[PDB]
Design a protein around this ligand. Structure first.
Ligand SMILES: [Br-]
Ligand SMILES: [Br-]
Ligand SMILES: [Br-]
Ligand SMILES: [Br-]
Ligand SMILES: [Br-]
Ligand SMILES: [Br-]
Ligand SMILES: [Mg+2]
Lengths: 131, 87
């Protein structure tokens, strides 16, 4: 399996975000985890990475502020645990959904479910970094 | 499955788009099945906005499955492409 696909508990702090959170996903380092989401998840345990991802997008879709930034189509996906689809301009082939990347590699000491180690990125932006 | 949008009636295509849009789990029980249907949608419509019709729709029209269908129908008509099978 991947290094992130491991049991753990969410910890750490997110960052305050704006009215267009995922606008940051396509540039620089990615979009930070919103402080409200880091809070909602704090202390929860996950059996594996797909469990975390599912709880993360459900939390987004239930948040009164962030859910305003997503249309009904997207929320229908997120309520079910799925990541939203990115804009066509941010798709990179077969990858068409927002991805969560670790800023510090787990092999280099990074926290798997530390919210300060996570960013949301589009596929196009991820590949700009790693190809 | 139907291969070309001209095999759908408009009502059939609306019901496929409503299924994708509402995330109907009876049709798409898995995330992987939904992704496939979105890729199928992009292929069928041939529309240059692709999945943005569903998720990032133009503010000039209704954000709904009917809005999506109408946009697709009117765009293909305006390019001289084949339309829906008659109902
Ligand atoms: Br995007
Ligand atoms: Br992910
Ligand atoms: Br860790
Ligand atoms: Br019809
Ligand atoms: Br509708
Ligand atoms: Br038609
Ligand atoms: Mg990464």
């Amino acid at each position: 399996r991947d290094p992130r696909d491991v049991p753990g508990a969410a910890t750490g702090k997110g960052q305050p975000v704006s009215g267009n959170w995922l606008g940051a996903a396509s540039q620089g380092e990615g979009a930070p985890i919103p402080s409200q989401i880091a809070d909602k998840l704090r202390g929860k345990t996950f059996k594996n990475w797909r469990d975390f991802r599912e709880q993360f997008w459900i939390a987004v879709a239930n948040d009164p502020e962030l859910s305003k930034q997503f249309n009904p189509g997207s929320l229908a996906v997120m309520r079910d645990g799925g990541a939203p689809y990115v804009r066509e301009s941010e798709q990179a082939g077969g990858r068409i959904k927002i991805e969560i990347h670790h800023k510090v590699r787990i092999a280099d000491g990074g926290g798997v479910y530390n919210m300060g180690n996570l960013v949301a990125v589009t596929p196009k932006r991820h590949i700009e970094i790693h190809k | 499955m139907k291969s070309k949008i001209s095999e759908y009636t408009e009502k059939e295509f609306l019901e496929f788009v409503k299924d994708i849009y509402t995330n109907n789990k009876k049709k798409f029980p898995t995330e992987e099945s939904h992704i496939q249907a979105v890729l199928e949608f992009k292929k069928l419509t041939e529309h240059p906005s692709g999945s943005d019709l569903l998720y990032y729709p133009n503010e000039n029209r209704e954000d709904s499955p009917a809005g999506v269908v109408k946009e697709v129908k009117e765009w293909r008509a305006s390019k001289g492409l084949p339309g829906f099978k008659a109902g």
